[PDB]
Design a protein around this ligand. Structure first.
Ligand code: NAD
Ligand code: NAD
Lengths: 480, 320, 124
């Protein structure tokens, strides 16, 4: 373990002393090539060279060689510039990125303007790629300056590695940028330059990281319209359906728990393409973590319950198959898809719906009270508090969130005569929960013009007055 | 004196690297641990981020209280007086008021990208920077910029949860007084014509030209049911000539190749055929079938990979 | 119980190897007829052949013969098309239906347009 450290420290000491002492035109590039070859030998050790490469990057940082590389990036010669850039590319670890965010911003940004040679651009794209992972301030300083324009211009190239670096750069900038960063990307049409990166049949990782960047840009609700107008969401789902996560899990050694927290809100952002990307990546990385013995990270973060929500509320076969495979490669059971005819539910479907979403404590509570699907759609505060033993209001509010999620995805064919659920869905997709509350009072499309606010409060059970005002306004202005 | 908790607030709510690095170094030179920067996507929080936010600001007594109640970031943004008093064991109103001060500080620095459609947080921030705490309360009721002119004070009190009447009057006043067939078809070769076709589609959609792509998607057994509806609706035509583009079109006397079908359909329509040559020599007229020999008399445009903008402008000058 | 499985697995191994190896015009339909006759012998066992037929459909799926049937459904010949369709008709179990929903949609849909012969339509 520590033998490679003792073999690699004095060689880099001699090499950095040669780089600090010699200031010629060709021996300096030879020293950069020696250091970069030792870096290549450091990263290619099976399950050893990770901490070894981190220690060697710490030794380069504590010697002062990072400022030496920042000086050599401003050299007028091209060859020592491209070797210094390719050496700086492979050493951007989380302790070095703080130093580059302190000083190195503005020197790499100066290289972002020189775009015509390929040997600069292939490495400067990777340097900017790894520098988008630092913080939101570095993302603002790169996007507000000419750091985003370099990536959006380098997307025009045909280099099968430079486009990978640009795809990962835009993906990391979408993950770690923020609201203003996503606005300055998409208003400058960063999603449209990912279209040759999502379609190119020469590389399979490149299209996946491009669709990852498209999905992370599509998780923002103020952004989805221009992304749908871009047309890059149409290439996501056949790409995910046409590939297998096991081959891409054998190809890649995973990501840490900080980056695993970025894949979790891809599933709870109610977009089909983002859920497919998140299910594919969590299935492949769950295969990776199931090859190892660290499957408790998904239970600490909480992606397992999101995969159970994907299975129990699936309208697509691909994301459901990926979520079932991801829950199968972990240590828990897979749930079943629920029957959508909720007014046609008996007691056993209600018990299954309790067991699939995390209400195993209250399974004996509903069985003694004989709650079927007709009583589940018509359950309130007081019956949960008194009759069901659910005294905590926070547990009741979590149950009403799950009830909102259930009454959104529900079949009302046994009681809806005039298709009122599509009338509620045309205004706001969260209005479809009151379909049973308005149908059970005897209403249809031809009777909403004589309904008051008290009839929606007391009988229909609409507790929010904003929703009552919107339903009354839409019932008065366009029906009759 | 109490500068340590202020340094912890600086670390946990940092928008600058310099003051955060100085506060981390100051807490490192003292005898306590440094906290972590919180994840700003508070509606995307699970339980562990809520527990970390409790541990970083000084609510270590109530860490076991929120875990048994399963409070995530969605329930933390929607927590009130009564649930703190009864369900959470926080009986003291002064402790509840300190928790609402910390909740104000949290809901000021928060990412609402998963739910804000019309950028309501910047609308609240343009009036007063302490108004951004009610972003979740106004978005969770289904509101946006186009619906605030029909909201009353009772809807802000009961549903949105705005307890101060001055803020309700200012929000109502500011809500009332200032608020209120594709054209270009591209056929390409399967081997080396995908990237150039996608690049042409992007450079034409930068100028508003609707471009149809994915001929290979229609190659799943659909013979002529959608190719005719695509080409007849297409205002123009772009023929990507890869190296070896018209190799499969030679000796195709049975109309089986899809690029040959596109060329025959475009010549039957008579549309403006604009060829794009990427290192490809012009083939012979006699080796092609007679239903496609007219393609050699159109003004093709040579492609330059390092001078693409002038070439795209030359394409735009040669279209309708 | 497991005797019919041990009698029916290597025969279908030899038959699917003959279907994978031979690419003629009439021996392929004869191999499809042999597999379909073994399927008819598999479904007609009293209270035995249910799990046996499910295991044989699993053996056809894991060998890759479902993609072979999806290739033979796009054959220009009519006879191998109708035997491949009648073989695909009797093997649509809940594990095979997921694979047909993944890939096989669009090939059977192409056969839904050809409607005039009865021998295609009775199986499609
Ligand atoms: N083969 C190569 O050339 C190679 C390989 C890796 C990295 N690099 C270089 O290293 C630099 C980036 O490295 P980085 O350290 O900043 O990566 P990163 O922090 O951006 O990505 C997270 C990495 O840390 C690991 N990790 C962190 N915490 C973990 C945990 N608790 N459990 C398991 N795994 C955990 C993950 O496996 C993942 O690989 C770049 O310059 C890159 O070019 C090069
Ligand atoms: N005689 C025949 O030729 C024959 C007979 C049966 C099936 N098939 C073929 O099999 C395929 C369809 O079969 P399938 O498996 O998909 O049917 P299916 O799943 O659509 O129908 C349900 C079948 O499973 C049985 N079943 C499932 N769970 C049960 C349980 N818990 N207890 C008791 N019985 C249970 C039922 O008896 C019923 O027969 C088709 O290709 C069909 O042509 C052919």
């Amino acid at each position: 373990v520590q033998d490679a450290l003792e073999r690699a420290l004095p060689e880099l000491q001699q090499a950095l002393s040669a780089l600090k002492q010699a200031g010629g035109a060709r021996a300096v590039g030879a020293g950069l090539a020696e250091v970069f070859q030792l870096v290549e030998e450091a990263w290619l050790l099976p399950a050893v060279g990770r901490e070894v490469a981190q220690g060697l990057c710490d030794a380069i940082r504590l010697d002062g060689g990072l400022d030496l590389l920042l000086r050599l990036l401003q050299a007028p010669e091209l060859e020592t510039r491209v070797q210094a850039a390719r050496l700086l590319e492979q050493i951007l670890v989380a302790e070095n990125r703080d130093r580059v965010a302190r000083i190195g911003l503005g020197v790499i940004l100066n290289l972002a303007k020189e775009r015509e040679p390929v040997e600069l651009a292939r490495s400067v794209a990777g340097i900017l790629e790894h520098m988008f992972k630092h913080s939101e301030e570095t993302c603002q300083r790169l996007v507000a300056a000419g750091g985003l324009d370099a990536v959006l211009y380098w997307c025009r190239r045909t280099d099968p590695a430079l486009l990978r670096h640009c795809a990962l750069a835009l993906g990391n900038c979408a993950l770690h940028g923020g609201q203003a960063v996503q606005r300055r990307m998409v208003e400058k049409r960063a999603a449209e330059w990912l279209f040759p990166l999502a379609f190119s049949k020469e590389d399979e990782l490149l299209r996946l990281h491009a669709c990852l960047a498209v999905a992370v840009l599509a998780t923002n609700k103020e952004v989805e319209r221009e992304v749908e107008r871009s047309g890059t969401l149409a290439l996501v789902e056949p790409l995910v359906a046409s590939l297998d996560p096991g081959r891409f899990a054998r190809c890649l050694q995973g990501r840490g728990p900080d980056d695993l927290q970025r894949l979790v809100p891809l599933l709870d952002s109610n977009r089909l393409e983002a859920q497919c990307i998140g299910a594919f990546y969590l299935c492949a990385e769950a295969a990776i973590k199931s090859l190892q013995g660290k499957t408790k990270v998904f239970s600490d973060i909480g992606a397992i319950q999101s995969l159970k929500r994907l299975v129990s509320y699936s309208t697509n076969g691909t994301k459901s198959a990926l979520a079932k495979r991801a829950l199968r490669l972990l240590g828990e059971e897979v749930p079943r898809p629920i029957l959508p005819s909720v007014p046609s539910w008996k007691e056993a479907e209600v018990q299954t719906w309790l067991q699939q979403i995390g209400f195993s404590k209250y399974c004996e509570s509903f069985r003694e009270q004989q709650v079927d699907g007709d009583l589940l759609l018509r359950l309130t505060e007081e019956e949960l508090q008194t009759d069901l033993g659910m005294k905590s209001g926070i547990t009741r509010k979590r149950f009403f969130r799950e009830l909102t999620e259930l009454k959104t995805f529900a079949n009302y064919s046994t009681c809806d005569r005039s298709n009122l659920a599509d009338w509620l869905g045309s205004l706001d997709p969260r209005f479809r929960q009151y379909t049973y509350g308005l149908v059970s009072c005897g209403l249809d499309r031809s009777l909403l013009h004589r309904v008051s606010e008290q009839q929606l409060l007391e009988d229909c059970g609409i507790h929010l007055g904003v929703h009552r005002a919107r339903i009354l306004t839409a019932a008065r202005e366009m029906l009759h | 004196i109490g500068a340590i908790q202020s340094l912890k607030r600086l670390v946990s709510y940092s928008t600058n690297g310099t003051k955060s690095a100085l506060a981390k170094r100051a807490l490192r030179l003292l005898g306590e641990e440094v906290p972590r920067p919180i994840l700003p996507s508070v509606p995307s929080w699970k339980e562990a981020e809520v527990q970390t936010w409790l541990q970083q600001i000084g609510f270590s007594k109530y860490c076991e209280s929120f875990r048994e109640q399963q409070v995530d970031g969605d329930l933390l943004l929607r927590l009130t007086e009564e649930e703190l008093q009864t369900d959470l064991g926080m009986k003291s109103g002064i402790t509840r008021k300190r928790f609402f001060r910390e909740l104000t500080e949290l809901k000021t620095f928060a990412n609402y990208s998963t739910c804000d459609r019309s950028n309501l947080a910047d609308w609240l921030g343009s009036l007063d920077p302490r108004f951004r705490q009610y972003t979740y309360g106004l978005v969770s009721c289904g509101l946006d910029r186009s619906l605030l002119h029909r909201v009353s004070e009772q809807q802000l009190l009961e549903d949105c949860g705005i307890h101060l009447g001055v803020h309700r009057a200012r929000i109502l006043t500011a809500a009332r007084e200032m608020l209120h067939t594709p054209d270009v078809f591209i056929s390409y070769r399967r081997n080396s014509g995908s990237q150039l076709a996608s690049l042409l589609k992007v450079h034409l959609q930068l100028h508003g030209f609707s471009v149809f792509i994915d001929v290979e998607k229609l190659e799943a057994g659909k013979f002529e049911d959608k190719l005719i509806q695509s080409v007849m609706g297409a205002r123009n035509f772009v023929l990507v000539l890869s190296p070896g583009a018209l190799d499969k079109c030679m000796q195709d006397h049975d109309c089986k190749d899809w690029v040959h079908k596109a060329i025959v359909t475009a010549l039957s329509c008579g549309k403006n055929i604009v060829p794009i040559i990427d290192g490809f020599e012009w083939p012979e007229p006699q080796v092609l079938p007679e239903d496609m020999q007219a393609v050699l008399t159109f003004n093709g445009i040579k492609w330059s990979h390092e001078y693409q903008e002038a070439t795209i402008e030359k394409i735009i000058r040669f279209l309708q």
